Design a protein around this ligand. Structure first.
Ligand SMILES: CCCCCCCCCCCCCCCCCC(=O)OC[C@H](COP(=O)(O)OCCN)OC(=O)CCCCCCCCCCCCCCCCC
Ligand SMILES: CCCCCCCCCCCCCCCCCC(=O)OC[C@H](COP(=O)(O)OCCN)OC(=O)CCCCCCCCCCCCCCCCC
Ligand SMILES: CCCCCCCCCCCCCCCCCC(=O)OC[C@H](COP(=O)(O)OCCN)OC(=O)CCCCCCCCCCCCCCCCC
Ligand SMILES: CCCCCCCCCCCCCCCCCC(=O)OC[C@H](COP(=O)(O)OCCN)OC(=O)CCCCCCCCCCCCCCCCC
Ligand SMILES: CCCCCCCCCCCCCCCCCC(=O)OC[C@H](COP(=O)(O)OCCN)OC(=O)CCCCCCCCCCCCCCCCC
Ligand SMILES: CCCCCCCCCCCCCCCCCC(=O)OC[C@H](COP(=O)(O)OCCN)OC(=O)CCCCCCCCCCCCCCCCC
Ligand SMILES: CCCCCCCCCCCC(=O)OC[C@H](COP(=O)(O)OCC[N+](C)(C)C)OC(=O)CCCCCCCCCCC
Ligand SMILES: CCCCCCCCCCCC(=O)OC[C@H](COP(=O)(O)OCC[N+](C)(C)C)OC(=O)CCCCCCCCCCC
Ligand SMILES: CCCCCCCCCCCC(=O)OC[C@H](COP(=O)(O)OCC[N+](C)(C)C)OC(=O)CCCCCCCCCCC
Lengths: 80, 491, 506, 205, 75, 158, 90
């Protein structure tokens, strides 16, 4: 089903909706790592997952900062 | 000595000319002495360097031995081994001789920037002169392609109305094809681990791999010596390039492609050269017959001479692929004889008429033998030489090339004899029209040939008739060199 | 030395008062830090000892003579870039003061050099993801360093989204590898190089292919490079490829152990497609930076053929090409940052809006450079002639060496296409040369006093007043003669590349 | 007695007589035709849902319109590839092995079948010129040795002892023909006659 | 070996001479400039020859092992 | 002979008649192009350019070079092809053909008699020519037997 | 002076020794140029006879005409690439 690229129908029509899809996409990677690590009883996989959660947070903050300044750049008359 | 003296002096000369001209640029406007008389001092220094280049090679011509088989004057400069043999020596001599003549031809017919033009002309001549004296395919290719950078700028900067089309033609035609010659050079460096001439002459390759390398190399050669159907660049570039660029592009650049056969195809790809020689004859005979017929319907004065260049070069390729000494010696003498007659015509057509009336259309010129008699004597004299009249150096080249063609292949090689008739059709029609009937009603009476333009003509005609009357000057150098190119086992 | 000095620059910059002179002086502190880094690096790191390959920091980082070559190259090219922001590129206060309006510019650049230099050394999938983010995050910030600009911010937003998807693909490949084997260290994975799905390493490459702008992903790179300020485009279009292409070469070195043909066909499909777009794309363009964006894609296509072939001659082809292409790229962009002084000024039609971010934006703004400055026009001509591949410049030896590596491994189809694609691309390199010079003789004697350079004040009218600053002129001249005169020392340089090893040994 | 012409062909893995079990030409094209039809058909419906979600937005319809396939293309493309895969495999069995002229023949006809469907409103000469053009690309792609020569690369020959790593010698003449990438100092004359033929200077005058 | 640094220095003179044209100044401007650009490249030229001589020593030793490996292959 | 004031005379003679578009003793040296300063060179431009302004393809600056530098180069090329002691391969092969007759026919007194009395200048015209020399024995000896080892170089046969 | 030909065959040398291989090529070239020189001498003998005999030229110049038409096909320059690169014995 997803070979027809169904996930494109599931992503909204705003720049903020793309940002969320990136997080939900990466969330799948971390859940996959936690799954393998627990079955193998391997904590190295859990170190990887902890890094992925922390790195996925820094990516969100930078992306939102760019989006925020993108928004105020239009609303930059400020001649009052 | 040779190459080291030939590069270091020319680099020193190029630096000297740049220093003199560009000193006054600064922040202020300049009215210096070197600009007076149209950069005349800077043009003179450019003309002297052309004469000195000839003196360098003669210093090494004296030491040349005609009875020694093998490269002489071998030296290593820039990690590249150079050298001279019989065939290469004469082509080097032709290349450097056209140096002063190319510069002298454009003495006072450019709108400006003469220093740039003089540097480029001496640069192109050196690059082409050095191309005959390297001893590996890679270095052959480096010099074979480096001439595009000045030639493309020179034609674009100094060209005629369609200079942009001409510049875009020489750069792309001669690069999109010579890149196919790079592929076959690379494959030589992959299997043999060396591209040196001598090392690769002794190796035999599989007859499938011989066919690939030949096809790659002959693609790069069939464009430089324009063979139909990839000749479309030459008529366009000739009709638009500066007059000095036409003397080098016809005098020397075409002969680099016949020398390409001598180094890159016959010695190392000897078995597959025999197979392609029937096919080469078909392409060249059709080039000879079609180029002659196409010339009969042309209108631009400088195009008409351009196609006459293609018909002769087809005959040169016909002779060189003949597997005998008669064809090879004839092809090389024709290249030398064509190297003087072809530039002479462009002077007559694009250098004497075009500098007075600025129009290349044939319809405006007739009856020129009335108020320009000295012009019409040389046009008549050079018309005959261009068509293989027996006393010129072209007849010796064409007769031997035709003779060698019949020896190699009696049936189809005999069709080379159509060169004697067809060359007289488009050429004599052009001369008979120019110097016939009443003087034209569209032109105005002006000066006849000036003293400078006589000097250019006399010193392109004098070498032509010496080689015609006594061609053994060329032959005594060629014989031992040209005899190493023949592949035949008789039992 | 890099990291320790970065903290000092971070703290110090936040203390002193916001001014252009202090911002420009801090940029000259970073130029020292990068220079100091190179002296310490070259002192301890040697080709003769790093030949075997040395594990560092609990095997997370592995360094050998192939990686070590690029770290020094990256440091060198980062010196030539910082010279732009640290000195005058024109000397006109209006145009130049943009480089000094940002105090965190040099800090972010120093952040990236740490990111760039560590990426080729990675040896763990856990640190591969961390380092690739450190480099990726630094580029987005540098793209948006001029936060007032509408186009710059719009580009960083486009850059962040594409890179985020690119990083997710990279992260997902590593997770899949960990799922199959449970191992994170790359050396431990090599023990199971025959037991894992080799296409999961290809999914890793598909993420690194996005970040170098390879077709079909090329669309965003062309848009990004044609919107950022020319000083920014000069950095983000070259540096990522220096450190990612080195990483791609190593990953392909491990991949060719099992010599899977299906992997090579897909990559050949992308290399072949990219040459087509890299050549035919630039034929119909007006913006110079869009032109150099298509030019960049074509050269990356050539450099992948050396990577894809991956033999002993592929190290030489890649090591030489990546060096000469960086110097050519710096030389061309440095000239475009200078020749903006010769632009005319209106006293109309087509309403072309120019900004201080890209004063030179269109190809026909290079018109008559043969007249305004002949010496620098030839330098741009020599640089473009190298990109064309005219011998005996540096560019010819790159294509010649790449062809050897390509054909020696049987890539006949790609070798012919690259030689077709090179000639097609010569059309749009020739247009730059057509605009530079072809209309010289009609414009030779013209009354020009409306150039931007004519708004410079007259100092004394007795002393000589050079038109171009000192440092930028010396860099342009040095790199133009190195490009032109490589034939003199080519044999030594190539023999200096035979020694760069990636586990060849014996 | 036939003529002697050059043979400019890269080496190929020769299949012994009795090898080359042919492959089902119907089944192979069925997979590509059916499979490509579902993908192109499925992506069309998926792109229709994106049209419904956003229509007034200029940028969204700007990009969705590029990927849109006309009703002829959604039918013409799967047929052409199905025709391409059937003709490419079928000509492979007739030749007892894939050849450039087979791939030229399959690609040109399959394009003509396809082009005549999704490009009806164009002169038939305009289609044949395009179909012949697309034939050449597949002729050259097969002639060049697919994407890679593979086992016939010089690297493979060198790694198999069939390269010029061993030098050359005049006292060691090989009766058999040398490999494609191999070079020799001297050759048996019978190999020259079997290639050049007697005549113009070989053996006799 | 001084002649090798002589050539490198003369390349240093060319760059400063080529710098003058780009700046559009007389070629006699600031004669001390040619000394600094000359000495800079002699320093580079001095190190460059050290690097290449170092390459010769390394490459001779590596080729000693490569020749032995080829003999094992050519058995 | 720059003669700075000689320009001022040209300046004054022109100045008296400012009307335009309505001499021999001027000849520079190499020194004035480079050593001279701008201001003295600045005036020289106006005098020379506008002297022509008040106007047969002679003295164009090239005749001094080509007639002195180029033409003697051709004489040097023409001399070399005329009086050089280069021995071509075929001329060598004629002397070698006869030098083998001497070595292969030392018992033949009459043959060596013709070779001995022959001069080294007339080696190239054996046969019918204007020279009153006898070579019947020389020609007869070559006809009877061959004096080459082309088969001697080929030790392999079908 | 008159340089002596280095009488050397392709069948006794190693082509790895490119100095000796050069002599084998130079020696095979020089012998062929002798045959042409031998041929040009024989043709001179034919020309005297025909001019001197007149009507009897068919008789007094019988074996010279026969020999000249026999040496013509093989008394020509053929190069060394044919014999260097081919092995008649095989
Ligand atoms: C303005 C002039 C333009 C240029 C001039 C054009 C003419 C030049 C080309 C023609 C050359 C002359 C004709 C070629 C044949 C003459 C040589 C000859 O005699 O051929 C005989 C040869 C074998 O002879 P035979 O003994 O009969 O065959 C049995 C062998 N056991 O082999 C044969 O049997 C040949 C058979 C007849 C020849 C067929 C080809 C003739 C050329 C046709 C070209 C058409 C255009
Ligand atoms: C605008 C054009 C201006 C240029 C026009 C040029 C026209 C000039 C005509 C001459 C052309 C150059 C030919 C003369 C120079 C070469 C002479 C030569 O090579 O002689 C060689 C001949 C045999 O050589 P050898 O015996 O070995 O000893 C010679 C040592 N050098 O040694 C000899 O013993 C020969 C002695 C000389 C014989 C007379 C030479 C007269 C040459 C002119 C007539 C040529 C033949 C007749 C042609 C007219 C048509 C039939
Ligand atoms: C400025 C250029 C400085 C060059 C410094 C290069 C260097 O010092 O290292 C050379 C490096 C070889 O080093 P290695 O083999 O590892 O062992 C020796 C270490 N002691 O060799 C390498 O592999 C480094 C590879 C990169 C080399 C780039 C070439 C240098 C380009 C010169 C640019 C000059 C620009 C003009 C500077 C103007 C300054 C105002
Ligand atoms: C419960 C089921 C749910 C629905 C399932 C169907 C999902 C809809 C998607 C369409 C179905 C086709 C694609 C399905 C996955 C791709 C096919 C695949 O994975 O390969 C399997 C199949 C043949 O497999 P086989 O050779 O038999 O393997 C055993 C060998 N001993 O390979 C095939 O040849 C199958 C047909 C694929 C050919 C179609 C594509 C050909 C090229 C058309 C272009 C498609 C779009 C191009 C986009 C490229 C972008 C760069
Ligand atoms: C299955 C989903 C649909 C297919 C997607 C295919 C994805 C892979 C494509 C790789 C390149 C990515 C191209 C960018 C996306 C293009 C999407 C597209 O098709 O847009 C349509 C566009 C032209 O749009 P247009 O036809 O004007 O408007 C249609 C009106 N309904 O059409 C185009 O511009 C496409 C052409 C772009 C350039 C592609 C050419 C690549 C080179 C191939 C030839 C190589 C030849 C080399 C010679 C040797 C090999 C034969
Ligand atoms: C002042 C002293 C100059 C330097 C002297 C020197 O160091 O000798 C190096 C070389 C002398 O030659 P040598 O060492 O014997 O071997 C050939 C190597 N070129 O001499 C040289 O290497 C100087 C050559 C540099 C000038 C030529 C530059 C080439 C420019 C491109 C030419 C186009 C080629 C295509
Ligand atoms: C033998 C090989 C040596 C290497 C030569 C390298 C060329 C660099 C020369 C720079 C000097 C300069 O920039 O000077 C400029 C000079 C002379 O200009 P002008 O007319 O006096 O000034 C004009 C302005 N005015 C009159 C108002 C003062 O023109 C040249 O450049 C010509 C030669 C180079 C053109 C082609 C370059 C292609 C490079 C690639 C070749 C493979
Ligand atoms: C000029 C090309 C000459 C080859 C023609 C050929 O190879 O001949 C026609 C070919 C192959 O036909 P085939 O059936 O494989 O040939 C015989 C098959 N055997 C052996 C089984 C009997 O067809 C084609 O479409 C070839 C496409 C032309 C590609 C041109 C590439 C040029 C690159 C040059 C690199 C140096
Ligand atoms: C306006 C002007 C237009 C151009 C005019 C032409 C100028 C010519 C200058 C002559 C100089 C000379 O002679 O250089 C001589 C010197 C020293 O040579 P050596 O001691 O024998 O070293 C060995 C040289 N081999 C191999 C010839 C024997 O080499 C050089 O410095 C080389 C120039 C530097 C090229 C760049 C490579 C180094 C940087 C590596 C980064 C990729």
């Amino acid at each position: 089903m997803d070979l027809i690229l169904l996930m494109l129908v599931a992503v909204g029509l705003n720049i903020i909706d793309i940002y969320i899809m990136i997080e939900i996409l990466i969330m799948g990677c971390t859940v996959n790592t936690i799954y393998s690590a627990s079955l193998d009883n391997d904590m190295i996989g859990l170190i990887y997952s902890l890094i992925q959660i922390i790195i996925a947070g820094v990516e969100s903050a930078i992306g939102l900062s760019i989006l925020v300044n993108y928004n105020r750049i239009r609303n930059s008359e400020e001649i009052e | 000595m040779l190459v080291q003296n030939l590069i270091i002096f020319n680099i020193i000369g190029i630096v000297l000319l740049v220093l003199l001209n560009n000193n006054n640029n600064g922040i202020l406007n300049k009215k210096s002495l070197l600009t007076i008389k149209n950069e005349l001092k800077l043009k003179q220094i450019g003309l002297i360097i052309s004469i000195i280049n000839i003196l360098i090679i003669i210093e090494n011509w004296i030491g040349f031995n005609s009875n020694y088989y093998g490269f002489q004057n071998i030296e290593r400069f820039l990690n590249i081994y150079w050298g001279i043999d019989g065939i290469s020596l004469l082509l080097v001599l032709l290349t450097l001789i056209l140096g002063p003549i190319a510069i002298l031809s454009n003495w006072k017919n450019l709108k400006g920037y003469y220093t740039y033009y003089v540097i480029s002309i001496n640069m192109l001549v050196i690059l082409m002169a050095l191309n005959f004296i390297c001893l590996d395919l890679v270095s052959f290719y480096i010099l074979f392609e480096s001439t595009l950078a000045p030639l493309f700028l020179l034609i674009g900067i100094y060209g005629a109305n369609n200079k942009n089309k001409a510049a875009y033609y020489v750069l792309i035609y001669t690069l999109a094809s010579s890149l196919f010659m790079l592929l076959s050079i690379v494959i030589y460096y992959i299997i043999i681990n060396s591209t040196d001439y001598i090392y690769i002459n002794n190796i035999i390759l599989s007859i499938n791999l011989q066919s690939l390398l030949f096809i790659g190399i002959i693609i790069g050669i069939a464009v430089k010596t324009p063979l139909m159907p990839v000749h479309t660049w030459l008529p366009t570039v000739h009709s638009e390039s500066p007059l000095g660029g036409s003397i080098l592009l016809a005098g020397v650049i075409l002969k680099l492609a016949i020398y390409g056969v001598i180094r890159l195809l016959l010695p190392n790809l000897s078995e597959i050269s025999m197979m392609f020689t029937p096919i080469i004859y078909i392409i060249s005979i059709l080039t000879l017959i079609y180029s002659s017929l196409i010339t009969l319907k042309q209108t631009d004065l400088k195009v008409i001479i351009a196609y006459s260049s293609i018909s002769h070069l087809a005959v040169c390729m016909i002779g060189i692929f003949a597997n005998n000494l008669i064809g090879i010696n004839g092809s090389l003498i024709l290249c030398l004889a064509h190297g003087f007659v072809s530039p002479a015509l462009f002077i007559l057509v694009g250098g004497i008429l075009y500098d007075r009336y600025h129009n290349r259309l044939i319809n405006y010129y007739q009856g020129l033998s009335t108020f320009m008699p000295i012009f019409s004597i040389y046009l008549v004299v050079f018309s005959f030489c261009n068509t293989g009249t027996p006393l010129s150096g072209n007849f010796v080249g064409e007769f031997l090339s035709i003779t060698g063609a019949v020896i190699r292949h009696p049936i189809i090689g005999s069709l080379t004899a159509a060169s004697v008739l067809l060359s007289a059709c488009y050429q004599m029609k052009l001369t008979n029209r120019l110097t016939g009937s009443v003087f034209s009603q569209y032109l105005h009476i002006t000066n006849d040939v000036t003293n400078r333009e006589i000097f250019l003509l006399n010193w392109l005609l004098i070498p032509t008739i010496i080689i015609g009357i006594y061609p053994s000057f060329v032959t005594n150098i060629l014989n031992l060199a040209s005899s190493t190119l023949i592949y035949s086992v008789l039992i | 030395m890099l990291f320790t000095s970065l903290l000092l620059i971070i703290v110090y910059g936040s203390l002193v008062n916001k001014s252009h002179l202090l911002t420009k002086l801090i940029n000259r502190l970073g130029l020292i830090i990068i220079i100091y880094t190179l002296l310490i690096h070259l002192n301890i790191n040697t080709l003769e000892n790093l030949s075997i390959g040395i594990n560092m920091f609990n095997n997370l980082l592995l360094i050998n003579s192939f990686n070590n070559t690029i770290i020094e190259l990256i440091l060198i090219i980062c010196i030539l870039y910082v010279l732009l922001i640290s000195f005058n590129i024109t000397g006109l206060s209006i145009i130049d003061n943009l480089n000094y309006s940002k105090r965190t510019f040099i800090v972010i650049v120093l952040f990236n050099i740490i990111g760039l230099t560590l990426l080729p050394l990675v040896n763990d999938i856990m640190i591969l993801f961390i380092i690739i983010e450190l480099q990726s995050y630094s580029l987005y910030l540098l793209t948006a360093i001029f936060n007032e600009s509408h186009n710059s911010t719009k580009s960083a937003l486009y850059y962040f989204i594409v890179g985020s998807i690119a990083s997710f693909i990279i992260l997902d490949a590593t997770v899949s590898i960990y799922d199959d084997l449970g191992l994170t260290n790359i050396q431990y994975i090599l023990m199971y190089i025959d037991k894992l799905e080799i296409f999961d390493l290809l999914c890793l490459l598909f993420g690194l292919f996005i970040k170098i702008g390879l077709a079909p992903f090329y669309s965003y790179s062309i848009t990004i490079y044609s919107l950022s300020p020319t000083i920014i485009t000069n950095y983000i279009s070259l540096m990522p490829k220096l450190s990612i292409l080195t990483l791609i070469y190593i990953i392909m070195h491990y991949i060719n152990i099992v010599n899977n043909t299906d992997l090579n066909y897909v990559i050949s499909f992308l290399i072949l497609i990219s040459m087509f777009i890299g050549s035919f794309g630039g034929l119909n363009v007006i913006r110079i930076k869009t032109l150099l964006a298509y030019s960049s894609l074509l050269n990356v296509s050539y450099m992948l053929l050396a990577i894809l072939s991956n033999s002993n001659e592929s190290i030489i082809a890649y090591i030489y090409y990546i060096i000469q292409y960086s110097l050519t790229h710096i030389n061309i962009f440095s000239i475009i940052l200078v020749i903006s002084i010769y632009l005319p000024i209106m006293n109309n039609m087509l309403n072309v809006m120019i900004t201080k971010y890209s004063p030179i934006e269109y190809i026909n703004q290079l018109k008559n450079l043969f007249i305004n400055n002949i010496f620098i026009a030839i330098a741009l001509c020599i640089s473009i002639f190298s990109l064309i591949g005219i011998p005996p410049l540096t560019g010819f030896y790159g294509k010649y060496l790449v062809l050897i590596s390509g054909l020696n491994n049987g890539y006949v189809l790609l070798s012919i296409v690259l030689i077709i694609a090179s000639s097609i691309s010569t059309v749009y390199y020739a247009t730059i040369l057509k605009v530079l010079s072809f209309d010289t003789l009609s414009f030779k004697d013209i009354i020009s006093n409306n150039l931007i350079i004519n708004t410079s004040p007259e100092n004394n009218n007795n002393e000589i007043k050079p038109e171009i600053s000192n440092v930028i002129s010396y860099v342009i001249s040095s790199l133009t003669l190195i490009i032109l005169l490589i034939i003199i020392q080519y044999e030594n340089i190539v023999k200096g590349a035979y020694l760069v090893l990636l586990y060849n040994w014996v | 007695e036939q003529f002697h012409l050059p043979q400019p062909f890269w080496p190929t893995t020769k299949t012994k007589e009795g090898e080359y079990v042919p492959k089902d030409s119907i089944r192979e094209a069925s997979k590509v035709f059916i499979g490509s039809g579902v993908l192109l058909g499925g992506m069309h419906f998926r792109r229709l849902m994106q049209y419904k979600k956003g229509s007034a937005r200029p940028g969204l319809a700007k990009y969705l319109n590029l990927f849109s396939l006309s009703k002829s293309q959604l039918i013409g493309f799967p047929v052409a590839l199905g025709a391409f895969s059937f003709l490419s495999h079928s000509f492979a069995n007739l030749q007892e092995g894939q050849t450039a002229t087979g791939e030229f023949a399959a690609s040109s006809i399959a394009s003509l079948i396809g082009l005549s469907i999704f490009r009806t409103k164009k002169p038939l000469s305009s289609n044949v010129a395009i179909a012949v053009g697309m034939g050449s690309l597949f002729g050259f792609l097969t002639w060049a040795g697919n994407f890679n020569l593979g086992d016939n690369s010089y690297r493979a020959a060198l790694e198999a002892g069939n390269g010029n790593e061993g030098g050359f010698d005049n006292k060691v003449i090989k009766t058999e023909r040398q490999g494609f990438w191999e070079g020799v100092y001297r050759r048996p004359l019978s190999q020259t006659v079997e290639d050049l033929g007697e005549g113009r200077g070989i053996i006799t005058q | 070996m001084i002649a090798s640094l002589a050539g490198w220095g003369l390349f240093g003179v060319t760059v400063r001479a080529y710098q003058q044209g780009i700046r559009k100044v007389p070629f006699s401007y600031y004669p001390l400039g040619y000394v600094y650009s000359a000495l800079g490249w002699v320093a580079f030229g001095y190190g460059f020859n050290l690097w290449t001589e170092r390459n010769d020593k390394l490459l001779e030793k590596r080729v000693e092992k490569l020749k032995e490996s080829r003999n094992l292959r050519l058995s | 002979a720059f003669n700075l004031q000689l320009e001022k005379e040209i300046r004054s003679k022109i100045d008296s008649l400012p009307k335009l578009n309505n001499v021999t003793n001027r000849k520079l040296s190499l020194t004035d192009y480079l050593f001279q300063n701008a201001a003295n060179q600045a005036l020289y431009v106006d005098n020379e350019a506008d002297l022509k302004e008040l106007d047969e393809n002679e003295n164009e600056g090239w005749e001094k070079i080509m007639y002195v530098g180029f033409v003697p180069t051709m004489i040097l090329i023409f001399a070399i092809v005329l009086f050089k002691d280069d021995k071509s391969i075929d001329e060598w092969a004629m002397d070698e053909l006869l030098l083998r007759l001497k070595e292969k026919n030392l018992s033949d007194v009459e043959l060596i008699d013709e070779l001995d009395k022959l001069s080294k200048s007339h080696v190239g015209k054996i046969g019918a020519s204007e020279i009153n020399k006898r070579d019947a024995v020389i020609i007869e000896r070559i006809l009877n037997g061959e004096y080459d080892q082309l088969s001697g170089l080929k030790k392999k046969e079908l | 002076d008159h340089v002596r030909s280095p009488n050397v065959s392709f069948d006794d040398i190693d082509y790895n020794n490119s100095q000796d291989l050069h002599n084998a090529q130079e020696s095979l070239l020089r012998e062929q140029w002798i045959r042409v020189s031998a041929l040009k001498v024989c043709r001179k003998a034919l020309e005297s006879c025909y001019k001197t005999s007149g009507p009897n030229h068919y008789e007094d110049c019988r074996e010279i005409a026969e020999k000249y038409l026999n040496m013509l096909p093989d008394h020509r320059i053929q190069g060394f690439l044919g014999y260097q690169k081919n092995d008649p014995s095989k």
